[PDB]
């Protein structure tokens, strides 16, 4: 029962005020049952598209979540993952650099 | 049901051919088996068909399978008296022990025997222990004759039945009648027995 | 590859415990129990993939299964009911798709046993008229006064069962068709050559195996306990 | 030199609940999906039917429809057969397809994993366990190998149908398989500098920090990460002393640029 790695990154270069897409890439987990949320300011974003789940050469699973967003000076963005392999949800914040 | 057989039942004369149908919706369909079940007995496998378009034979029995149409037929050439039985179609949904069998309800075949030389007679038979008790044996009548059930309920009359003396290649119909509160001349009056029936003594 | 079932025939009472057994000496892992009821194909009740495994089939309710060993698979009716009147078939198999069927078990579950009664058997000797008119000799056997209708009639000549020249009524007739728990009668014929009947070293016997009460069934009436038994009648040939 | 992969994932939570989902990849492009919720396989490209006629496709899909339902009952039945040796929850994965080589050559494969471990393959004319597999699988293998109709069907799928189908897909999907999409890059820091590179296809790419013409051997490439539009993302980090950032550039090479490398100076 392996722990999910989470990476958060933007599709285009981030400019404040400019529309973009934010990606949450969740990898290296099993079993495949998983709950993924993308958060703006700790609140759940409604229109989140999910890729079909697949798996790597090592048989571990992966999936890509993405959503439209516009970065600003103040707003935080994050990806929250619940999995049976963790006691509590794991949240990684978008760095603003990525 | 997933396996349908036709006809439900049929009556044929000895020597005639007949065809039995099996249509199914079972998916997938690995193979189809035909079973013969005599009255009160077990299941005797006649053939198993395994290919998409298949044909098999086993003496007087032959069969086809078409998996596209989900249809099988069993053919019986030149029916004998021993073919009187129930014929059952079964579809196996795997080529392994993981499969489930899907049984049809069966077709009842009756084969009427071909009595060459009738010699219709009514005999009296006596008990081996207590000599003054008896039965009446209507025998040797051809398969045109119907033996009607008993009018008086103190008289008992069985339905006809055919025996086959194997080593002599001989077959014969008979029915038995008896009573306590009666003679063999009056025993089969309510049946349409032949005009030439032998009543001895 | 052979499979046996015991008992082959059983009369039981509502609320009784009935255990149908299947034995199998093929070292097959897999065993399967079906019931056959007229108007339906065989339906799977329970099955087993090895010692200790028991799995529900399509119609498991009212039955418990038991696989104590590789050889034996049992079907247990803890509280038997009339709806479990049927013919039960067992089968075995290895990893292949073929199931090898046993000969079947006939079960009748009655509401009550008060009318159960074994047959009287009588053997009727050939007519001399038949002998002169045909050179054949027909013996008739009569089983009467029995209930229920689970009987097996067979003919034995000099201690060996005969099939050639035999025919037995396909169904027992009712002695009082008005009455619902009516006793039954059954007839059979054995036709032989006149010279075979005329030979006095030939011993003829009609046998009726009747299925009724077991040793452990309660019997409250005055008359003899109507147990499962054989009743036969008997005669020698003569010139 | 392309690999075609049908990836199946099946979860059996208890004896009455299961789902099976599939995705299909030609290289790193998704060609099909088959959700448990759908009765039919979905095309995710215009060219996903390949060069198969509509009748050939319908026949093939139908065989898979039978397989998914049949697979599902076989696993549940195999669990009963081994009980109590193994029980639910159970995960089964299949990876199947073929790699296409130049000429008319291919290798087909069909590998099966149980609770995340590769345990079974189809090879030649039969199923077999692979090194490291538990011995209890010999009974399932024995049972699966008794099914001759499945053996013959799988042999035909692996030997003939798969390479034929994939040849057609390669022809039909050429202009997507050979697409060129330009990377765009940008810079940032946390001292650790980061060169972000995003939007490129195909996967091969070269990313290095530079001081003029000196390649900085401290450059660390992260993993290739996917974007939603079937392009790739990659980042290259360099760890440095604060106040040493002047003079550093990130240089990116990719086939889509036609020789015109991206150079971003700090
Ligand atoms: C495009 C080209 C794509 C190429 C890639 C191909 C993907 C290959 C993967 C697809 C494999 C296709 C099999 C098709 C045949 C099939 O459907 N077999 C079924 C149905 O079979 C019955 O019906 C057919 C009807 O024609 C025949 O009549 C058969 O005779 C009859 O038995 C079988 O139930 C089969 O067993 C399904 C499952 C096969 C399978 O997964 N086996 C591997 C699983 C190993 C699991 C071991 C682990 C385990 C887990 C838990 C407990 C115990 C063990
Ligand atoms: C199908 O091809 C195999 C050989 O190909 C290998 O196995 C495939 C399933 C796939 O994984 C390929 O990439 C492999 O190269 C044939 O298997 C041989 O069959 C013969 C006789 O039937 C037997 O003696 C050999 O031992 C088998 N070879 C091996 C390596 O095990 C198979 O017969 C082919 N079937 C059809 C129907 O074409
Ligand atoms: C089986 O598993 C599902 C999914 O985990 C669960 O919701 C369901 O309650 C379970 N059902 C039974 C009958 O145990
Ligand atoms: C998956 O599909 C099967 C067959 O269509 C269905 O019976 C089953 O309920 C589905 N499973 C889930 C978890 O939705
Ligand atoms: Na029929
Ligand atoms: Na006679
Ligand atoms: Na039935
Ligand atoms: Na009885
Ligand atoms: Na199954
Ligand atoms: Na797995
Ligand atoms: Na072994």
- Spatial separation of the C-alpha atoms in residues A61 and D46, rounded to whole Å: 27
Is D160 within 8 Å of D154 (Cβ atoms)? no
- Spatial separation of the C-alpha atoms in residues C162 and C229, rounded to whole Å: 21
Let me know whether C97 and C3 are in one domain: yes
- Spatial separation of the C-alpha atoms in residues D78 and C56, rounded to whole Å: 14
β-pair partners for D250: D209, D264
3-state secondary structure of D57: helix
What's the Cα-to-Cα distance from B58 to each of B118, B172, C163, D4, rounded to whole Å? 33, 28, 24, 48
Spell out the residues 6+ positions from residue A45 whose beta carbon is closer than 8 angstroms to its own: A37, A38, A39, A67, A69
Min distance A41 CA to chain D CA atoms (Å): 22
* DSSP-assigned letters across all residues of B150-162: PSSTTEEEPPPEE
For chain C, the domain total comes to: 2
Method: X-ray
Measure D16 CA to ligand 4 centroid, in angstroms: 10
φ, ψ at C116 (rounded to 5°): -70, 130
Residue C199: name the closest of C153, C152, C137, C156 by CA: C137
Spell out the residues 6+ positions from residue B60 whose beta carbon is closer than 8 angstroms to its own: B76, B77, B78, B80
Instruction: Find the radius of gyration of the CA atoms of chain A.
Output: 14
Q: How many CA atoms lie within 13 A of C208 on its CB side?
A: 29
What's the CATH superfamily of B1-113? Immunoglobulins (2.60.40.10)
Residue that is written with structure tokens 């494969």 in the block: D109
What's the Cα-to-Cα distance from B64 to each of B47, B52, B72, B144, D34, rounded to whole Å? 10, 10, 5, 35, 37
Structure tokens that stand for A15 in this block: 């400019």
What's the Cα-to-Cα distance from C237 to each of C168, C202, C216, D22, D241, rounded to whole Å? 21, 5, 41, 81, 124
Is C39 within 8 Å of C22 (Cβ atoms)? no
3-state secondary structure of C159: coil
End-to-end CA distance of chain D: 39
The H-assigned helical ranges of chain C are: 128-134, 194-198
Write down which residue in C76, C111, C146 finishes a domain: C111
What stretches of chain B adopt beta strand conformation (E)? 3-6, 9-13, 18-24, 31-37, 44-49, 53-58, 61-66, 71-76, 85-92, 101-103, 107-112, 121-127, 134-139, 155-157, 161-165, 170-179
* Interstrand relation of C105-110 and C9-13 (parallel, antiparallel or unpaired): parallel
What's the Cα-to-Cα distance from D39 to each of D20, D61, D64, rounded to whole Å? 12, 10, 10
Spell out the residues 6+ positions from residue A71 whose beta carbon is closer than 8 angstroms to its own: A10, A14, A15, A16, A18, A20, A77, A96
CA trace torsion A42, A43, A46, A52 (10° rounding)? 30
Asked if B30's CB is within 8 angstroms of D74's CB, the reply is no
Is B41 within 8 Å of C103 (Cβ atoms)? yes
CA trace torsion D244, D245, D246, D247 (10° rounding)? 100
Which H or E run includes C31?
Answer: strand C30-36
The CATH number of D179-266 is 2.60.40.10
The CATH number of A1-98 is 2.60.40.10
* Interstrand relation of A43-44 and A35-40 (parallel, antiparallel or unpaired): antiparallel
CA trace torsion B53, B55, B56, B61 (10° rounding)? 130
Is B87 within 8 Å of B34 (Cβ atoms)? yes
Give the pocket of ligand 1 (CB within 6 Å).
B 28, 30, 94-95; D 6, 66-67, 70-71, 74-75, 78-79, 82, 86, 90, 92, 94, 96-97, 110, 112, 114, 120, 140, 144, 147, 149-150, 153-154, 157, 161-162, 165
The residues spanned by each domain of chain B are 1-113, 114-201
The residues spanned by each domain of chain D are 1-178, 179-266
Is C142 within 8 Å of C122 (Cβ atoms)? yes
The H-assigned helical ranges of chain A are: none
Is B98 within 8 Å of B111 (Cβ atoms)? no
Q: Which residues of D touch A54 (CB under 8 A)?
A: 7, 23, 25
Residue that is written with structure tokens 């978008």 in the block: A94
Residue C85: name the closest of C39, C36, C40 by CA: C36
* Resolution (Å) of this entry: 2.4
The CATH number assigned to the domain holding C184 equals: 2.60.40.10
- Spatial separation of the C-alpha atoms in residues B99 and B93, rounded to whole Å: 5
Ligand 2 neighbourhood includes D91 CB (under 6 angstroms): no
Q: Domain D1-178 classified CATH 3.30.500.10?
A: yes
| Domain that includes residue C146, residue range | 112-239
Spell out the residues 6+ positions from residue A42 whose beta carbon is closer than 8 angstroms to its own: A76, A78
Domains D1-178 and D179-266 share a fold: no
- Spatial separation of the C-alpha atoms in residues C46 and C25, rounded to whole Å: 20
φ, ψ at D36 (rounded to 5°): -55, -35
3-state secondary structure of B132: coil
Evaluate the omega torsion of the peptide bond into residue C238 and state whether it is cis, within 30 degrees of 0: no
Helix D138-146 / helix D54-82 crossing angle, nearest 10 deg: 140
Write down which residue in C111, C133, C153 finishes a domain: C111
């Amino acid at each position: 029962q392996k722990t999910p790695q989470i990476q958060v990154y933007s599709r285009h270069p981030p400019e404040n005020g400019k529309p973009n897409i934010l990606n949450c890439y969740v990898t290296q987990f099993h079993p495949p049952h998983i709950e993924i949320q993308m958060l703006k300011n700790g609140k759940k974003i409604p229109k989140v598209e999910m890729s079909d789940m697949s798996f790597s050469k090592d048989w571990s699973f992966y999936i890509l979540a993405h959503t439209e967003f516009t970065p600003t000076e103040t707003d935080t963005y994050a990806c929250r993952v619940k999995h049976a392999s963790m006691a509590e949800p794991k949240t990684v914040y978008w760095d603003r650099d990525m | 049901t997933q396996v349908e057989q036709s006809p439900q039942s049929l009556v044929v004369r000895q020597g005639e051919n007949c065809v039995l149908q099996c249509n199914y919706s079972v998916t997938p369909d690995n193979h189809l088996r035909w079973f013969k079940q005599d009255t009160g007995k077990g299941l005797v496998s006649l053939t198993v068909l395994v290919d998409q378009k298949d044909k098999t034979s086993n003496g007087r029995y032959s069969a086809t399978l078409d998996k596209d149409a989900k249809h099988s037929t069993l053919h019986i050439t030149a029916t004998l008296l021993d073919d009187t039985a129930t014929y059952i179609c079964v579809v196996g949904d795997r080529g392994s022990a993981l499969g489930r069998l899907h049984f049809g309800a069966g077709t009842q075949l009756i084969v009427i025997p071909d009595i060459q030389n009738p010699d219709p007679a009514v005999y009296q038979l006596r008990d081996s222990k207590s000599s003054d008790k008896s039965v009446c044996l209507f025998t040797d009548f051809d398969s045109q004759t119907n033996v009607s059930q008993s009018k008086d309920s103190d008289v008992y009359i069985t339905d006809k039945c055919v025996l086959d003396m194997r080593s002599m290649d001989f077959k014969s119909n008979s029915a038995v009648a008896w009573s306590n509160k009666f003679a063999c001349a009056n025993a089969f009056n309510n049946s349409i027995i032949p005009e030439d029936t032998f009543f001895p003594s | 590859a052979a499979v046996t079932q015991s008992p082959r025939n059983k009369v039981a009472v509502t609320g009784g415990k009935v255990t149908l057994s299947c034995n199998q000496t093929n070292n097959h892992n897999n065993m399967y129990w079906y019931r056959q009821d007229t108007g339906h194909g065989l339906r799977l009740i329970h099955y087993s993939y090895g010692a200790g495994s028991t799995e529900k089939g399509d119609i498991p309710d009212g039955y418990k299964a038991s696989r104590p060993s590789q050889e034996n698979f049992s079907l247990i009716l803890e509280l038997a009911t009339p709806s479990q009147t049927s013919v039960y078939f067992c089968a075995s198999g290895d990893e292949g798709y073929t199931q090898y069927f046993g000969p079947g078990t006939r079960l009748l579950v009655l509401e009550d046993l008060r009318n159960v009664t074994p047959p009287k058997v009588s053997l009727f000797e050939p007519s001399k008229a038949e002998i002169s008119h045909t050179q054949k000799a027909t013996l008739v056997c009569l089983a009467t006064g029995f209930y229920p209708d689970h009987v097996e009639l067979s003919w034995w000549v000099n201690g060996k069962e005969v099939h050639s020249g035999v025919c037995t009524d396909p169904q027992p007739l009712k002695e009082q068709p008005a009455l619902n728990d009516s006793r039954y009668s059954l007839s059979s014929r054995l036709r032989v050559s006149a010279t075979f009947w005329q030979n006095p070293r030939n011993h003829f016997r009609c046998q009726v195996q009747f299925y009724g009460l077991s040793e452990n069934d309660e019997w409250t009436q005055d008359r003899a306990k109507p147990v499962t038994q054989i009743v036969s009648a008997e005669a020698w040939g003569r010139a | 030199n392309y690999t075609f992969r049908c990836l199946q994932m099946s979860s059996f939570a208890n004896r009455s609940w299961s789902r099976t989902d599939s995705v299909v990849w030609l290289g790193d492009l998704q060609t099909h999906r088959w959700s448990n919720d759908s009765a039919t396989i979905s095309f995710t490209k215009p060219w996903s039917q390949g060069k198969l006629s509509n009748q050939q496709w319908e026949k093939l899909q139908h065989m898979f429809q039978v397989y998914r339902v049949s697979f599902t009952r076989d696993i549940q039945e195999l669990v009963k057969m081994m009980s109590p040796k193994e029980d639910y929850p159970i995960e089964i994965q299949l990876s199947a397809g073929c790699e296409m080589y130049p000429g008319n050559a291919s290798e087909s494969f069909l590998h099966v994993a149980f609770q995340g471990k590769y345990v079974v393959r189809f090879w030649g004319t039969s199923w077999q366990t692979v090194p490291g597999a538990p011995s209890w699988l010999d009974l399932p293998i024995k049972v699966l190998n008794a099914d001759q109709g499945t053996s013959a069907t799988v042999q035909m799928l692996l030997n003939d149908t798969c390479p034929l189908f994939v040849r057609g897909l390669l022809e039909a999907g050429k202009s997507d398989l050979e697409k060129q999409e330009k990377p765009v890059a940008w810079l940032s820091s946390v001292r650790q500098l980061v060169c972000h590179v995003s939007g490129f296809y195909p996967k091969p790419v070269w990313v290095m920090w530079m001081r003029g013409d000196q390649e900085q051997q401290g450059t660390h490439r992260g993993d290739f990460l996917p974007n939603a539009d079937e392009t790739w993302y990659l980042q290259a980090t360099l760890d440095v002393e604060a106040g040493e950032e002047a003079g550093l550039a990130c240089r990116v090479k990719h086939s889509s640029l036609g020789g015109q490398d991206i150079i971003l100076y700090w």
